[PDB]
Amino acid sequence: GTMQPSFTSVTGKGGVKVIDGSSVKFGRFDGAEPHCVGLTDLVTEQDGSSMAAGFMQWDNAFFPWTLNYDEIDMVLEGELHVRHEGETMIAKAGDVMFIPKGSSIEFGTPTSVRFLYVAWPAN
Amino acid sequence: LELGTMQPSFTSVTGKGGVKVIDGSSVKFGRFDGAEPHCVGLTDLVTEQDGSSMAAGFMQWDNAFFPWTLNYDEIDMVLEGELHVRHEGETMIAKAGDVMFIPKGSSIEFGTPTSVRFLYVAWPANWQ
């Protein structure tokens, strides 16, 4: 159906932002079409952050991507499979993954996944 | 153990191309010296030595508040319990599943009234 990215948040007087993770609604990530892959950007350069952060969430899909920036991923639910130079790396719920700038990869999950990504630069 | 040995440790796998995966269940915490006299757990997992522009790791502790000044931007992902950050007098609470952004330069109080386990991701990676 309709997938508009949204989230509720609180920002303190000095700029500390807290995002309510339960409130996150996913937009479709166009770069993964024909698959329906969820992505919502939560922290951006508009917050004064050097790093971009957001959530991704999808079921049963793999898609190619080239990262022009470093990325750290934190798996909240399910499992994230990442394919790079032939090898598949798997991060299950509670695991942390680092993907280096310039990596041409396959992002995917054969089951389902929810994760936080943190990228540098924000641009 | 809070009055015992706290050696930071973690298991990981790294692919031929530099993609690294850390087994979160294997993380054992060191004491964060910057939180003393409180016993606060911290283990760095991703560092400039991995070729990373960002530093990342886990922190975990029970019932304790301590002061800290950040010379880096920090994104925090609360995995268990609750994180309370006080900045400019105001307390911000991030529960399990929530994300927090703390701007570079901020002098804060880090704490939890109960317990907390969370991931931090910091830029620059070489802030210390």
Side-chain angles (χ1 to χ4, degrees), chain A residues 1-44 47-91 93-123, chain B residues 1-48 50-128:
Chain A
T2 307
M3 288 185 58
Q4 180 175 305
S6 195
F7 64 91
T8 281
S9 71
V10 187
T11 299
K13 189 168 66 177
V16 170
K17 190 179 190 179
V18 180
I19 300 86
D20 179 6
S22 69
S23 82
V24 177
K25 297 302 194 292
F26 298 89
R28 262 176 298 267
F29 179 50
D30 292 3
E33 287 288 355
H35 312 288
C36 181
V37 167
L39 177 146
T40 306
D41 280 313
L42 300 173
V43 176
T44 75
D47 299 292
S49 177
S50 56
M51 297 168 275
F55 289 169
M56 294 195 67
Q57 171 171 291
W58 73 95
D59 293 352
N60 191 39
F62 287 78
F63 62 93
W65 197 246
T66 301
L67 289 81
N68 302 120
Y69 46 80
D70 286 338
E71 178 165 310
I72 286 168
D73 298 312
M74 172 76 232
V75 183
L76 312 174
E77 299 169 11
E79 71 178 28
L80 182 54
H81 291 219
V82 165
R83 205 186 58 198
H84 186 230
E85 314 210 345
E87 305 198 318
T88 295
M89 318 305 307
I90 300 178
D95 293 352
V96 183
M97 181 176 287
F98 169 57
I99 305 163
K101 168 165 182 179
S103 294
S104 280
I105 70 159
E106 180 103 324
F107 270 119
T109 183
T111 56
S112 63
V113 78
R114 185 187 176 93
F115 71 92
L116 173 81
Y117 60 88
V118 185
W120 191 88
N123 302 69
Chain B
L1 198 143
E2 298 179 17
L3 304 175
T5 296
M6 283 184 57
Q7 188 179 304
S9 193
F10 66 90
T11 305
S12 64
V13 187
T14 301
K16 136 181 65 177
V19 175
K20 194 185 187 184
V21 184
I22 291 96
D23 176 8
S25 68
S26 71
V27 174
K28 310 290 175 55
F29 296 85
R31 266 177 288 263
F32 176 49
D33 285 356
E36 291 278 14
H38 305 285
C39 183
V40 165
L42 182 136
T43 296
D44 286 306
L45 303 177
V46 180
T47 63
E48 59 195 310
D50 298 297
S52 182
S53 57
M54 293 160 290
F58 292 169
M59 289 187 87
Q60 187 177 267
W61 72 95
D62 296 339
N63 195 16
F65 285 74
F66 64 94
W68 194 244
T69 293
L70 294 71
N71 302 147
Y72 50 90
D73 282 326
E74 175 162 304
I75 293 176
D76 291 327
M77 174 75 235
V78 186
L79 302 183
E80 306 173 358
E82 65 188 47
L83 182 60
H84 290 218
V85 158
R86 200 185 67 197
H87 185 226
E88 300 198 12
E90 298 192 328
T91 299
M92 322 296 293
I93 305 189
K95 299 186 169 66
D98 296 347
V99 176
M100 188 176 284
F101 168 59
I102 307 169
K104 178 194 175 188
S106 307
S107 287
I108 72 173
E109 182 94 330
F110 263 128
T112 182
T114 51
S115 60
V116 76
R117 179 186 177 86
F118 70 91
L119 174 80
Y120 58 92
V121 188
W123 188 84
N126 71 357
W127 57 269
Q128 297 174 59

